[model samples]
Target: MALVSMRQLLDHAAENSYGLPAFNVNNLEQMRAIMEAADQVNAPVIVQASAGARKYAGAPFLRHLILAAVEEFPHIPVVMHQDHGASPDVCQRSIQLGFSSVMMDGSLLEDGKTPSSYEYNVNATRTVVNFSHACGVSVEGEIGVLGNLETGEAGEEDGVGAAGKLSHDQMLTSVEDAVRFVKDTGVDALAIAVGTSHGAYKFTRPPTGDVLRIDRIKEIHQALPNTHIVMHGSSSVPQEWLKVINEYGGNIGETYGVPVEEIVEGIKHGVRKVNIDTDLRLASTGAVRRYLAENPSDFDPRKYLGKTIEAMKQICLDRYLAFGCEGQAGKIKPVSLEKMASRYAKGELN
Candidate 1:
């Protein structure tokens, strides 16, 4: 009963002008932490699984963990989404596994690197949209490659970042291409690359206009007002967490992420879905590292796991309020996939 259509959720956010944070869930701890935060704030949830996440915690385990969150928190609306689906085949498998939404990131090839031709991206996205809409699942299509403009790198190497350095034109998504991509793919959501990259190492310093092109988001929104816009690599990696990690025997470089004010500004400009992954990772690691180091005698994993959950929950709460998603869970009526399928069949969503 907790499973709902992401198409509906995006529409809801668009109507209200708020951004929904899509957090990547890799384990039971992450799942519970996300749900607890969403529960406290009365916000709808988006728990995404990346390729690495699926491999780390087998698909079956990941599915059950999401299902468990649904049952455990009956009042909250939860969307089980596949993040960075490299191919139509991968997207189809997630749909078969009961994911309510899937991202067909055709900006790159199946390798999750190498940029693809415009026609290639359109074809791949349209293929997934055709299949997913028929099944009442939402499709998120990426128009441009996401990378760090400051360093000309893809930031993350684990699952879905690009391989080589990205040129200036390749880093930021143009408004023209975005409108075209939406018209061609008919995807439920559009992920625009506005100079944001994946993972924690987004920027070496506070991002200004040159490094992060948030204004590009406004331009695209103005061009495609009817479409739901998504912002990837939008996590604001808190420095406090990094400080805690470093103080507790962990070493990480200085980095910055999309600021909270900047994201809220995007919400005003039609950014309905904001992809967040690194912040939770930072919070969880920082919490665990500090807790175990301080309480050296504590052997039970639960003690430290609780700290991690608490830390992650705080980050979730902050985003929920900042993005104006607080109390949205109660507002949503939880439209089912069957209804969504009918909407797609009638060409209402397209």
Candidate 2:
């Protein structure tokens, strides 16, 4: 099947009361792992590219990798999304480059450090919404800044979050603001800041405090029931992978991620799209490091990369089952981008 729009996929997910994990892809192997796993489990796929991913793999290569996935796995429905588009222009370029969806992350300023005002966010996001929807592309807009709750600091370690220390209000997205933001921006999905940061070190401990705020998702869902909710920083950093990294001569400090159960709870409320990148990062690194350390004489990159693909596929399959996306691929009669464009032209889409 051709690449389907993100709105079409998310709408299907909303109807089924399940969540889709949008995995970030930077290479051929990662894209292959995602599609292969989704095909294995009969799950729909959301493969996204971050700016970091674009930097690692040239934009054209990344786009072609996804196109290649579609060719290889024609049965699985796939949505190629831009993970964290910094501006309306970046999103425009992504749409031009054949991305099915683009996230207008106006939560932070164009610098990707300072948090922007509501007016700034709405204006920037609305521009993308108008432009993207006209092209039959889905637009995801961020409302509050992504940050740490306990320390009250924007989690900018991975270069995708705000820079300075944030206030308590800034750490959590307000339901009131989200309702208005959704209505004003006309976004297909709304990425909310519910106290989850962007990196592996999401918390210093197991997230038991008010840090996760899964309940806030319920409130936001109640307010904007039709608007698909998105959870960024939703990766559950596997302790086993972290242990493998440490055992194989790496020193990742003690850190925690949003627990899978908490994310499941969020999905129960309304989260249709869950953005996960760090887990696959940890898994790939651990698999490669373990493979090389055990086979010191091996120089074959493909040998270690095969392990990387296996590791990522496991995570993808796990997310598919855990988020209730298993067997959904055949269930969705995909609406192609051309049909979506016709819907937009007819003013049939929200």
Candidate 3:
């Protein structure tokens, strides 16, 4: 559980033909669940924080949670990442605060606008990239707007912000734009807008219309085979959780997520990094609520959050298996560790 670069994880994923899960974490429990799952499965993972997470947990608290996780799970490779950073300064602060990866999301920029012209996006991103890469950290930048992740309505406990489906235009990022953006920003990974949004309610119905313009993903892949492609808000909201939520007096609408099967299909199509946040969160609360409902006498946070962690671990394992990354830790030597030891010193391992 040492800080590791996403480059190593991505390389392992590319070799193993699976996308590494970037779980969103807003608290100690969420962080614990994600790290425990990765450690138990011997899989590498990313723990990302949205702005809302920072607001709730506080940046120092979030960063310390990551460091504590590292101390607890010394074998797992964990990346502390900032999810959907609005500007380069945001990315810079995240990196300074020990985030291994940062996402510069300019999607919310005023319409008919470009992230580069803003100078903040380009210069800030370039600054962070230079410093982070120099320090052996990974960088992820978003070029296309996925759905309402900017709305931040999906909630923070699970990184479940946004609910609207992306318009054909809103959800689609051109291959040319993607290529240009990646090249211009020198980002290690590019988060594209295909069709996925940042929450459980992906499609109102079972996607009667076409889903995930696979053709566009293929186009981007063809244009930049060496560059990694990332799909954000990629959660396969399990039906079981929905059922539990409804069964427990929760009023979640009949919502669904990008199915794991579809994500598998995406992996086969060159999607190397999948950002999942809500599924684990859903699993956590669903299990805790159900357990508490079934046993109305337990009042300790540990009693309930303990169950939440276990539930989250189960979902993490499910994702690792579903993503075809069940046993990939052996495939990756934490590039960051070696870089730190060699470039910094053997003592730095301490």
Candidate 4:
């Protein structure tokens, strides 16, 4: 298949009663791992690029890296999505760069730090949706601000998170707001904040009912049954990876991420897309650390970099199986952006 739109993949996932994991990518190793895993499992792939990723590996390089995956694995349908566009302008640039999908994360201002008002979010998101859908590209919009409810703060240091402290109400997404948001924006997917923050330090302990609220997902799903739900910061930080990193001379402190079980429960409700990043980072770092420590005499970077691919590939394979997206790629008939654009022209996508 070719570079399919995110809407197409998510729609298939909804029909099949499964969720697709969207992994953030920045380089060749990460792309290889994701494509190889998707190939092995026969699953559709969603490879997204974050702001930091673009800054590190420019948009041109990232586009070719993912396009290379499409050429290498023609059997797998891949969605090249911009993870979090700070504004409609950034999303427009991504669309020009040939992204199949763009996420207008209007939850925060263009600065990607201060939280915006509901009206501002609706306007910004709706603007991007109109532009993206016209070109047959999908758009994902954010509703609530993601933060750690335990301490009322967004954990990530540099990426898309609130810079100031958040109130409990601001952290949890309400059904009323979500409903209005979907109606106003008409986004292909809705990324709601249900008490999960970005990065590996999502939870200090195993998230309980008090922290990670899967019930909130049920409420939003019940309100908008047709709309696809999305979970940002859904990476399940494998504790064993942490141990490996620390045991092999890395000093990553105690931290936790969203549980795979909790993510599956969200899939059962209405979540069709799960954003995972930190897990792959952990896997890559730990693998390289262990490989270098075990074989100090090895001077070639290729020897250690190969370890990261396998380690990250394992996580991708596990996600594909656990999310029930295995063997889903070959099932979807490829849809061209032109045909999808025609559908949007006729108001069929909404």
Candidates 1 and 2 compared: the better one by lDDT is 1
Candidate 2: worst-modelled 10 consecutive residues by lDDT:
152-161
Cα lDDT of all candidates, in order?
0.90, 0.89, 0.72, 0.92
Q: What would the TM-scores of all predictions be?
A: 0.98, 0.98, 0.86, 0.99
What lDDT tens digits, residue by residue, belong to model 4 across residues 1-350?
Answer: 46899999999999999999999998999999999999999999999998899899987899899879989898899999998899999999999999999999999999998999999999999999998888999999999999998899887734678988999989999999999999999899999999998888888888998899999999899999998999998999999999999999989788888999999999989999999999999999999999999999999999999999999999999999999988898899989998899999998988
- In candidate 2, stretches whose alpha carbon ends up further than 4 angstroms from where it belongs are none
lDDT of 3: 0.72
Model 1 per-residue lDDT tens digits across residues 1-350: 65998888889998888889998899988888899999999999988888899889999999999889999999999889899999999999999888999999999999998899899999999999999998889999998889987678987735678888888888889989998899999999999888888888888889998788888988998999988888899999999999999999999999888999999888899998888888998999999999999999999999999898899889999999899988999999988888888888997876
What is the TM-score (0 to 1) of candidate 3?
0.86
lDDT string for model 2 (247-311, tens) is 99898999998888988898889899998999999999999999999999999999999999999
What lDDT would candidate 1 get against the real structure?
Answer: 0.90
Question: In terms of lDDT, which candidate is strongest?
Answer: 4
Candidate 4: stretches off by over 4 Å = none
Runs of candidate 3 with Cα error greater than 4 angstroms are 110-124, 148-167, 337-350
- Report the Cα RMSD per candidate: 1.0, 1.2, 5.0, 0.9
TM-score of predicted model 4?
A: 0.99
